[PDB]
Design a protein around this nucleic acid. Structure first.
Ligand SMILES: [Mg+2]
Ligand SMILES: [Mg+2]
Ligand SMILES: [Mg+2]
Ligand SMILES: [Mg+2]
Ligand SMILES: [Mg+2]
Ligand SMILES: [Mg+2]
Ligand SMILES: [Mg+2]
Ligand SMILES: [Mg+2]
Ligand SMILES: [Mg+2]
Ligand SMILES: [Mg+2]
Ligand SMILES: [Mg+2]
Ligand SMILES: [Mg+2]
Ligand SMILES: [Mg+2]
Ligand SMILES: [Mg+2]
Ligand SMILES: [Mg+2]
Ligand SMILES: [Mg+2]
Ligand SMILES: [Mg+2]
Ligand SMILES: [Mg+2]
Ligand SMILES: [Mg+2]
Ligand SMILES: [Mg+2]
Ligand SMILES: [Mg+2]
Ligand SMILES: [Mg+2]
Ligand SMILES: [Mg+2]
Ligand SMILES: [Mg+2]
Ligand SMILES: [Mg+2]
Ligand SMILES: [Mg+2]
Ligand SMILES: [Mg+2]
Ligand SMILES: [Mg+2]
Ligand SMILES: [Mg+2]
Ligand SMILES: [Mg+2]
Ligand SMILES: [Mg+2]
Ligand SMILES: [Mg+2]
Ligand SMILES: [Mg+2]
Ligand SMILES: [Mg+2]
Ligand SMILES: [Mg+2]
Ligand SMILES: [Mg+2]
Ligand SMILES: [Mg+2]
Ligand SMILES: [Mg+2]
Ligand SMILES: [Mg+2]
Ligand SMILES: [Mg+2]
Ligand SMILES: [Mg+2]
Ligand SMILES: [Mg+2]
Ligand SMILES: [Mg+2]
Ligand SMILES: [Mg+2]
Ligand SMILES: [Mg+2]
Ligand SMILES: [Mg+2]
Ligand SMILES: [Mg+2]
Ligand SMILES: [Mg+2]
Ligand SMILES: [Mg+2]
Ligand SMILES: [Mg+2]
Ligand SMILES: [Mg+2]
Ligand SMILES: [Mg+2]
Ligand SMILES: [Mg+2]
Ligand SMILES: [Zn+2]
Lengths: 69, 50, 114, 151, 61, 91
RNA sequence: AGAACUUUGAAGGCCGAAGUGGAGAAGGGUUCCAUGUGAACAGCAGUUGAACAUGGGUCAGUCGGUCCUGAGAGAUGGGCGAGCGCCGUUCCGAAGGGACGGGCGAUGGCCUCCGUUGCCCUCGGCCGAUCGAAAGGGAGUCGGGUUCAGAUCCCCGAAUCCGGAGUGGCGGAGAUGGGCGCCGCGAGGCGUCCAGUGCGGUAACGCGACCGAUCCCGGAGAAGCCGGCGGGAGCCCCGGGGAGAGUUCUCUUUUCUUUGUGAAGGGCAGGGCGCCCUGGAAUGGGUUCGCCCCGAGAGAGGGGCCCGUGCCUUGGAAAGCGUCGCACCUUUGCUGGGGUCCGGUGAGCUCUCGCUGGCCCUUGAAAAUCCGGGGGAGAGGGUGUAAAUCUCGCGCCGGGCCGUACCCAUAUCCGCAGCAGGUCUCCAAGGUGAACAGCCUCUGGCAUGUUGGAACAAUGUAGGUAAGGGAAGUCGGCAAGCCGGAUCCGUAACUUCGGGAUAAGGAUUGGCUCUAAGGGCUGGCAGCCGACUUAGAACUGGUGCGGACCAGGGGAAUCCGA
RNA sequence: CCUGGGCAGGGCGAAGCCAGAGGAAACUCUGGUGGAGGUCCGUAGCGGUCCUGACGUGCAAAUCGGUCGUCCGACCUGGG
C-alpha cells in the first residue's frame, strides 16, 4: 500500500476513476481513510477528530463509503 | 511418485478402471460360465511394473 | 521449540533454496525463501577488488525493472569503469598524443636539416 | 593438469574492428601490462615471438614450431627451452637443440617466443605422500595406481 | 534454578565435578581475547582523555 | 620462544616422510611461502597464487616466474644472454 | 450375541529432538476419506485394519516440468561397408531465409497518414541441427480462513513478474528562455532574430524521466575446502506485569501455558568499503584474537556508496490465539475487555551476511536471459505554437499445457511377506555433562513389535557376584577381569630431534558457609548494573566422594610391513 | 567424468608475530600469541578384528549383541 501525508493528493486520488471503495477506520486517537484502487490501497491517517468530522463530508458522493466497526 | 507424467497417469487410469469386481447381473446370463474375476490385481501383492 | 517444515517439493539444502524463518501475524514461525544476493558490477582493467559504487547490486534479470538512473553513473564510463581508471585513461591518452606530436615535430626538424 | 601458466594476450585485428584473444605459454619474466610484439621485424626481447631465421645463434627460445604454421608445438613444458645453433641463408634451414639433447634441422620460417617457460624447477619438490600425487593425476588422467605386472 | 544459584555461589564446582579440560571449560583463546580487548580499550580511553601521549601509548600497546 | 631445534616449516609433517626428504623440501618451503619485494610497487607483497604465478597485493601486477621462487637462476642468465645478443650487432 | 487385543476416561511406562515426532525426493498407484458386512485374507481372536462392497477425493502466470547448457548421446555434408548400418560432430559442406536503412512497383484501413506484399543495394562467422538436470543456472505470492479427504492452488484481503496498444489512454519530462523596438504609470501585450536532445555537487556521486542504428568493449549470471572474528534473526535464560491452570497436612508474591506483525513501498538504527576533499608524518603512527596498512598519502576532521533479513509506519487489528459470557443444541452468531506491556545478559545452539587468513606439482563448470559504457550512421517542431523519445507516476487486457491425495516406513518402496536387512535430505528443546556421548523429562507419537494364562525342573541364551590361591586350564590371558574423567608434581631407553607420552609411577575429588581476583555504563577520583570462572581456607558426613552414566591396563624384546 | 549434499566435541602444538632477560659482539634463553597436519581420543557416517558368541528348516539364500579400525579425508554419498 501507499501512505499519504499531505492534504491535497488523497482527495485527488479519491476522485479518480478506480476509487470504487473508500473505508473509514476509527482507532484510539487515529482515523484512517483507506481508498482502494486497482493497484494500490492509499491510506491517510489523522490524529485529530475535528479534522476528520469536517473531512468525512468532503468525500465525493456515490462512492459507497463503508464505516468500519 | 508424488509427481508423474500424463502418459504414466493415463496408464494407471486403465488399471484403476480394470480393478473392479464382477457385476451380479451376468451370473444369470445364458451360457455364462464366469464365476469370479481372475484379473483382480492387488496393489500390495502384485506390482504392475510401471 | 517449534519445529517447522519446508513449503516446496525441494528437500535438499542446495543453493536454489535458502530459507529464513519469520513470524507470521498468526503467531507461528515459517520459512521464507530468499533470492540470491546480487553483486555490484566490477570495473574493466581498473581497481580489481573494488566494486563499482552508485550502481544497484541485484540479480541480472532484475535490471529490467530498474531505471537507468539507478544502474549507471553520470560521468563517462559510468557503470562500466571506476573513477580512478577513467582519469588514468584520460591522462594516458592526452600524454601519448602529445608524445606523438613531439616525435612528429622531431622528425620534421631532423628532415629540415638532413 | 599443466605446470606452465597460460597468458591471455589481446591483439588488434588488422582487418576487422575487433580484439582477438589468444592463449600463449607464459614465458618466465613477463607481467600483466607488458606489450608483446609478434612479427618478423620485432625487437629481440623476452616474450616477443619472431621467426627463427632472423634471431642470431645461441638464442634461448621456447614454444616453437616444427613446420612453418605449426603454431607452437615444440618445447612447451614448464622450464624447457630450445637452443638455436646454426643458420643457412640459402636452402633455408636452422639447427636447434631440443631439451632432449637432440639436434634437429627445421625450417627458417617458423616462429618461436624468446625466453624460458615459467614454472622451472617444478620437479625439485618431492610429492612427499600419495595424496598430492592423487590430486595431481586426478586433473591429468586416470593412470596413477600403476599396479606392477609381477603382482 | 536453585542449582544454578548454587553454581553462581560456588557450590558443585569442585574438582570432583569437572569432566572436561580447563581449556574446554574456559577457552584460553577467549580469555586472551577478553583480557586483550579490556586493556586495549582502556588504553584508548586513557590516550583520548589526554592522560598519556601517543609516544607512550604505542609503547604501552 | 624457540620451540623446535632444527626442523622448521616442515615440522607440520611430523615423524613421517623420512628425514632427508623433509630436509630437502624445507629449502623451498621457506621460499614458496615467503613474501617478496615487488619489482613494480616496492612492497613485500608477492604471495604466489599458483605454480609460477606471482601477484602483488597493491597493484595486482601479476608476473610469471619460477615454481618455487620469484625468479630462477637459469632464467636470470637466459635474460642476460638475451640482452647481450640484442645489444651485439644490433639484434 | 460374542471383548485382553476395538473405542473413551484414569493410572503406570517407552521413544526423549542423531525419536517410536513433524515433512519431503526415488519407488508404490488408490493404498487417502466416509459408510456397511464380517466365510477368505491379518500366522490367536477381533465389533478392528493398508481386506472386502459402494460412494467421494488431487483446482497454480508468481510450487516444479516446460527454457539453458555441463560430462555425454546424436542426423545431414563426407567416408566406410555385401548389408540392416556404422565411424565421425566440425571434419574434405554453395551448411545465415533474418534484420537496420534506401529505391522501384502493387495493395488495404477515415488513400490526410500509415500497415503489408514483390524486386534491387548495403550490412550480418554459425562457434553448426537436435537431445541431455522435478538437487546445476533460471524474472515474479504472502497473511488469515475453509473440508470427512486440498493448500503458497479454494475464499477474503494485500502485492508482484512478463507480454499488447495500429485511429498511438490520461499526466509529467524533452516545454518553453534571451536580445531589439513599440504600446501600457505599473503588472503585462505585440512584431523580428536566436537558443533550447535535463539538471546539481570541486570531488566520491544524487534526482521523478534524460533521443539513439550497424558495430565494439565490459560486467552480472559464474564459483574450491578449512580456520578464525563481528553484525542480524530465531530458539534457549533471568527479572517485573496481566489472563488461565496445578499443590496447599506445613511452607512457597510459588510452579506451569501464552503475551503478534507476512510479501511489498518509505524513513531510521547497524554493518562493510581496496570511495572522495583539507592537510602530511620519524621521538614513527594509529590498529587485530591473529595479521596487516601508511609518502603509490598514515593519524585526525568532513563527505559518498552498497546490504539494510533489524526498528516504526501503509498493509495492521476488523482477521488469528487463552480467558470469563447472551441466544442455541442440525437457524450457533455476536458481545469486552487483556494481547502491538517494561527490560537485561550471554566463549549459549541453529541460519544468514561481511572481513581476514591458511591449504597446492588439487585453482576448483559452461550456456540461455539481462544490463552498462564507447562510438555518432540517422530522426525531430522549428518558436511566446509545439514535435522526435521516455528505463517516470498512473490506467486497460492476457498469461496456454502437464503433476498436485496418501506412505516415504522395525506395516503403503525392494528383499516371494505386516521380514532385527537395505534405501537420498530439512527442523530440531530442558537438566547433568566439554559435547548432537550416555542417562532422566517437555511438544509430538506408541502398545513392547505375527498371541495370553500358571509354575520357576534340567539344559540353553544374555547379565552379576563368590571366601584362599592368582593363569597352576588351555596350542595360546580365549573369554572375563584391572586402569579409565579432571586438577597438581614427575616422566626412562631410543630417535630422523618432529616423537615416544595420557611413558611409567604418585596425591586430591562430596556437602554446606566463606574470602580474594578476573568487567561495563553515567559526571567534572564517585555512583549503579549483570555472566560464571579460578585460587585459598574453615566446618562436616560410619575415608564416602568421575558415588549412576560416560571410560587408554602397562612394561621389557624378537619377525614383517616405513 | 559432470552436478549436489555431510562430517559433535577434546588432546599434541608447525610456520609467522609480540614482550622480557642474559651477552663486549655473534647470538641464546624464557613466558605468551598464533592454529598447520594425508596428526591423536572420540560421535554421526564408512568397513567388519575377536568372542571362531546367538541363530544356523534363522529375522535374514550372510543377520544380530558386545568388543572393534578410520572419522578433514587417498573421506562418505545421491542423481546424470
Ligand atoms: Mg444348459
Ligand atoms: Mg513384471
Ligand atoms: Mg533447479
Ligand atoms: Mg604397486
Ligand atoms: Mg596374486
Ligand atoms: Mg593455545
Ligand atoms: Mg485404551
Ligand atoms: Mg517416565
Ligand atoms: Mg542434525
Ligand atoms: Mg527420523
Ligand atoms: Mg467394517
Ligand atoms: Mg488370524
Ligand atoms: Mg485407510
Ligand atoms: Mg479394496
Ligand atoms: Mg491467485
Ligand atoms: Mg518456474
Ligand atoms: Mg553417428
Ligand atoms: Mg552418405
Ligand atoms: Mg533441454
Ligand atoms: Mg492462507
Ligand atoms: Mg493433508
Ligand atoms: Mg508493464
Ligand atoms: Mg556467526
Ligand atoms: Mg518490510
Ligand atoms: Mg547473539
Ligand atoms: Mg502432499
Ligand atoms: Mg523392516
Ligand atoms: Mg531397518
Ligand atoms: Mg542439553
Ligand atoms: Mg553446566
Ligand atoms: Mg502385546
Ligand atoms: Mg511388525
Ligand atoms: Mg575368588
Ligand atoms: Mg576374594
Ligand atoms: Mg596377585
Ligand atoms: Mg607366572
Ligand atoms: Mg605350546
Ligand atoms: Mg578379549
Ligand atoms: Mg631396555
Ligand atoms: Mg612405550
Ligand atoms: Mg562477597
Ligand atoms: Mg602396513
Ligand atoms: Mg586423522
Ligand atoms: Mg599414540
Ligand atoms: Mg565407531
Ligand atoms: Mg559384524
Ligand atoms: Mg559386512
Ligand atoms: Mg581375523
Ligand atoms: Mg560363530
Ligand atoms: Mg539351535
Ligand atoms: Mg571404536
Ligand atoms: Mg587405537
Ligand atoms: Mg583416529
Ligand atoms: Zn606490483
Amino acid at each position: 500500500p501507499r501512505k499519504i501525508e499531505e492534504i491535497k493528493d488523497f482527495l485527488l486520488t479519491a476522485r479518480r476513476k478506480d476509487a470504487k471503495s473508500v473505508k473509514i477506520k476509527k482507532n484510539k486517537d487515529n482515523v484512517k481513510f483507506k481508498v482502494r484502487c486497482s493497484r494500490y490501497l492509499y491510506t491517510l491517517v489523522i490524529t485529530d477528530k475535528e479534522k476528520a468530522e469536517k473531512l468525512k463530508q468532503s468525500l465525493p458522493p456515490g462512492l459507497a463509503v463503508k464505516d468500519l466497526k | 511418485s508424488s509427481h508423474k507424467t500424463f502418459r504414466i497417469k493415463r496408464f494407471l487410469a486403465k488399471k484403476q478402471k480394470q480393478n473392479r469386481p464382477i457385476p451380479q447381473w451376468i451370473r444369470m446370463k445364458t451360457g455364462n460360465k464366469i464365476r469370479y474375476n481372475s484379473k483382480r490385481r492387488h496393489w500390495r501383492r502384485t506390482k504392475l511394473g510401471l | 521449540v517449534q519445529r517447522l517444515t519446508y513449503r516446496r517439493r525441494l528437500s535438499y539444502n542446495t543453493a536454489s533454496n535458502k530459507t529464513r524463518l519469520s513470524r507470521t501475524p498468526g503467531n507461528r514461525i515459517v520459512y521464507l525463501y530468499t533470492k540470491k544476493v546480487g553483486k555490484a558490477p566490477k570495473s574493466a582493467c581498473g581497481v580489481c577488488p573494488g566494486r563499482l559504487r552508485g550502481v544497484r547490486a541485484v540479480r541480472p534479470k532484475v535490471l529490467m525493472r530498474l531505471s537507468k538512473t539507478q544502474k549507471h553513473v553520470s560521468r563517462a564510463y559510468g557503470g562500466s569503469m571506476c573513477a580512478k581508471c577513467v582519469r588514468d585513461r584520460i591522462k594516458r591518452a592526452f600524454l601519448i598524443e602529445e608524445q606523438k606530436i613531439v616525435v612528429k615535430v622531431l622528425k620534421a626538424q631532423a628532415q629540415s636539416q638532413k | 593438469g599443466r605446470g606452465a601458466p597460460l597468458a591471455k594476450v589481446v591483439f588488434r585485428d588488422p582487418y576487422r574492428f575487433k580484439k582477438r584473444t589468444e592463449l600463449f605459454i607464459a614465458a618466465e619474466g613477463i607481467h600483466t601490462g607488458q606489450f608483446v610484439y609478434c612479427g618478423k621485424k620485432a625487437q629481440l626481447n623476452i616474450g616477443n615471438v619472431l621467426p627463427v631465421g632472423t634471431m642470431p645463434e645461441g638464442t634461448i627460445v621456447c614454444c616453437l614450431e616444427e613446420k612453418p604454421g605449426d603454431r607452437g608445438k615444440l618445447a612447451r613444458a614448464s622450464g624447457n627451452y630450445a637452443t638455436v645453433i646454426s643458420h643457412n641463408p640459402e636452402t633455408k634451414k636452422t639447427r636447434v637443440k631440443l631439451p632432449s639433447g637432440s639436434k634437429k634441422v627445421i625450417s627458417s620460417a617458423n616462429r618461436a617466443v624468446v625466453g624460458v617457460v615459467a614454472g622451472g624447477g617444478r620437479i625439485d619438490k618431492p610429492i612427499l605422500k600419495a595424496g598430492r600425487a592423487y590430486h595431481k593425476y586426478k586433473a591429468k588422467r586416470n593412470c596413477w595406481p600403476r599396479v606392477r605386472g609381477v603382482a | 534454578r536453585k542449582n544454578t544459584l548454587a553454581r553462581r555461589k560456588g557450590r558443585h564446582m569442585g574438582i570432583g565435578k569437572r569432566k572436561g579440560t580447563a581449556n574446554a571449560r574456559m577457552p584460553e583463546k577467549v580469555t586472551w581475547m577478553r583480557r586483550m580487548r579490556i586493556l586495549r580499550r582502556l588504553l584508548r580511553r586513557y590516550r583520548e582523555s589526554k592522560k598519556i601521549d601517543r609516544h607512550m601509548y604505542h609503547s604501552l600497546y | 620462544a624457540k620451540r623446535t631445534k632444527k626442523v622448521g616449516i616442515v615440522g607440520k609433517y611430523g615423524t613421517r616422510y623420512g628425514a632427508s626428504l623433509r630436509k630437502m623440501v624445507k629449502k623451498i618451503e621457506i621460499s614458496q611461502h615467503a613474501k617478496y619485494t615487488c619489482s613494480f610497487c616496492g612492497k613485500t607483497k608477492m604471495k604466489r597464487r599458483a605454480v609460477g604465478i606471482w601477484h602483488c597485493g597493491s597493484c595486482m601486477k601479476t608476473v610469471a616466474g619460477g615454481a618455487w621462487t620469484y625468479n630462477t637462476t637459469s632464467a636470470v642468465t637466459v635474460k642476460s644472454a638475451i640482452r647481450r645478443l640484442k645489444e651485439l650487432k644490433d639484434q
